[PDB]
Design a protein around this ligand. Structure first.
Ligand SMILES: Nc1ncnc2c1ncn2[C@@H]1O[C@H](COP(=O)(O)O)[C@@H](O)[C@H]1O
Ligand SMILES: N[C@@H](CC(=O)O)C(=O)O
Length: 584
């Protein structure tokens, strides 16, 4: 009912007013519920909390921790320990973060109840959007949503990404009819494990229902960009399927054929229209030509995903880019209460019911620093902080690694601009390669130069999004001391050795999802890195302190390096990758 839908949106917005006005009390309540329910868990008992639930004692007694500090407990649960180690409720599965430890996905513990809080945060998005963009219940959203590979821990618990867990749960698969969660993609196309068949069937269904589409997107800008490239490579086949009403024989999955069969019908006029738009040389504005009622593009373009804004604006002819929420494997965090703001102005209001949030000011932690972490309501405007979380699933004062800046307040709840996940230097899609992983990968690769009496004088890197999929680029300046020229096969083996030493999310991107392309090494002229040092010296840097940065994001410096390239080489094949931790 239209009236019941209006009342539901009003009650969700009233909830936002209530919890942002009473933010500190909700924060205190959440911590009290976590600490009383888990009072008898081994982790709290061994730290001497003795069933105490007050914030003051919690901050004084409990250490602020990294993943590595609690990895013994996590691995014990992963290996079959069913006792109350971190949580009183049984750990239902591990949500495998894109963030890594030892080059492997971090295993974030979860409990079945956490799905309720993920659904609560999702339930706030459309009531917020509907204030600014009315009438979205009268059509469909064309979202490209994907499941990823799954594995089992040695103790039998599933280990899978948070979104794969969510789409496979009854909270999504058997969700009730909501005209605001009415998507062009049937559940069976999303839950298809074959990524090619999932993408093809979702793109075909999106085209079949094109006039009903009022918004388009994916969780990541990179994912949506990949869907547009898929249409670029497969539109003649997709239009043929529309014209004939027969689904491509390459879609062998029976659940996908059945779901597509309910949408796909012979439509030569639509096939003519799809072909006429896709055949055009320029794909500028192709989203608004095929999906003409699209109001906005809904994709995360904050953080590293901001690198995709020009590509998205090109395909959409400048439609609004909407960043709706901020979340992780360990905890769903907040919502953008200004979804029509510019990408550079996005701030996320953390919802105080999700977890107990603390903030480390940023300008090994001392006892004073740990005890004096700033509470959610006490953060200061314009100041930067590291996010620290205490969840219902066994994380106590866990450092997420995200650096946030206070942009403003919604009643007493702060609104944060996302700055960065600490130490991440390269990212194309969900891959988050840090400086240590890259350095060690380059160090493994340069061993191939040693038999040629050659060495790597200097290097840097950048995330190249000029191709789809995007790829990592390393700039190398070589020092040759021998008489045997280095052949291209050796540089190609350097490319592959780098890839083999990068983390499992990067290798998964190459092997499983095809979300990252082959890594490239670009050899630069001699004196190129000394020319970069001359820029730094002109801007105040000393010769005795300057270090060539491991990574560069600033376009004019990438252009400078790109102008000095002598030759380039690519990894000739994918690196190795298999689901789960190698240890298992
Ligand atoms: N809206 C967002 N904007 C920027 N970065 C985000 C956003 N949502 C998630 N992330 C990043 O992704 C991390 C979670 O990755 P994962 O655990 O793989 O879901 C967060 O801690 C952030 O570093
Ligand atoms: N967290 C995201 C990305 C990833 O883990 O690779 C997902 O659940 O799909």
């Amino acid at each position: 009912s239209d009236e019941s839908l209006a009342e539901k949106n009003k009650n969700k917005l009233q909830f936002i007013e209530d919890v942002t006005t009473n933010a500190d009390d909700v924060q205190r309540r959440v911590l009290e519920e976590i600490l009383s329910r888990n009072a008898d868990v081994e982790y709290l008992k061994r730290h001497g909390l003795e069933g105490r639930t007050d914030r003051e004692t919690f901050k004084h007694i409990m250490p602020v921790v990294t993943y590595e500090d609690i990895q013994p407990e996590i691995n014990r649960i992963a290996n079959g320990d069913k006792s109350q180690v971190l949580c009183s409720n049984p750990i239902s599965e591990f949500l495998t973060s894109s963030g890594t430890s030892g080059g492997e996905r971090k295993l974030m513990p979860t409990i079945e109840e956490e799905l309720d809080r993920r659904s609560l945060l999702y339930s706030l998005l459309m009531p917020v959007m509907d204030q600014f963009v009315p009438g979205l219940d009268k059509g469909k959203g064309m979202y490209f949503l994907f499941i990823k590979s799954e594995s089992k821990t040695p103790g039998g618990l599933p280990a899978r990404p948070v979104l794969t867990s969510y789409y496979k749960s009854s909270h999504f698969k058997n969700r009730p009819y909501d005209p605001y969660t009415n998507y062009t993609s049937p559940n069976q196309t999303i839950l298809c494990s074959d990524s090619y068949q999932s993408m093809y069937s979702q793109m075909l269904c999106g085209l079949c229902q094109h006039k009903e589409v009022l918004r388009v997107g994916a969780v990541f800008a990179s994912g949506f960009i990949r869907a547009i490239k898929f249409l670029e490579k497969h539109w003649p086949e997709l239009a043929r399927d529309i014209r004939t009403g027969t689904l491509s024989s390459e879609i062998t999955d029976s659940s996908v054929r059945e779901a597509v069969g309910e949408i796909l019908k012979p439509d030569p006029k639509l096939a003519d229209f799809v072909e006429s738009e896709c055949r055009k040389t320029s794909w500028q504005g192709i989203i608004t030509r095929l999906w003409p009622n699209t109001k906005y593009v809904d994709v995360i373009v904050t953080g590293t995903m901001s690198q995709y804004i020009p590509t998205l604006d090109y395909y959409s002819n400048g439609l609004p880019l909407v960043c709706t929420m901020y979340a992780s494997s360990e905890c769903y965090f907040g919502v953008n209460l200004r979804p029509l703001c510019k990408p550079s102005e996005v701030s996320y209001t953390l919802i105080p019911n999700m977890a107990y949030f603390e903030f480390l000011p940023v300008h090994a932690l001392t006892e004073k620093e740990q005890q004096e972490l700033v509470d959610l309501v006490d953060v200061k405007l314009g100041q930067e902080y590291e996010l620290v979380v205490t969840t219902y699933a066994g994380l106590y004062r866990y450092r997420v690694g995200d650096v946030l800046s206070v942009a403003g307040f919604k009643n007493n709840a702060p609104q944060f601009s996302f700055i960065c996940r600490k130490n991440v230097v390269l990212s194309i899609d969900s891959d988050k390669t840090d400086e240590v992983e890259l350095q060690n990968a380059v160090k493994n690769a340069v061993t191939h130069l040693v038999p040629f009496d050659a060495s790597l004088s200097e290097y840097t890197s950048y995330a190249d999004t000029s191709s789809i999929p995007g790829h990592y680029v390393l700039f190398w300046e070589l020092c040759l001391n021998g008489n045997t020229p280095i052949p291209p096969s050796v540089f190609e083996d350097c490319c592959l050795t780098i890839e083999e030493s990068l983390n499992s999310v990067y290798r998964q991107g190459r092997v499983s999802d095809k979300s990252i392309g082959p890594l490239e090494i670009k050899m630069v002229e001699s004196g190129t890195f000394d020319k970069l040092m001359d820029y730094a010296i002109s801007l105040g840097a000393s010769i005795n302190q300057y270090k060539t940065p491991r990574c560069v994001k600033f376009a004019p410096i990438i252009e400078l390096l790109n102008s000095r390239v002598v030759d380039s080489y690519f990894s000739p094949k994918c690196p190795k990758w298999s689901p789960g931790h190698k240890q298992w």
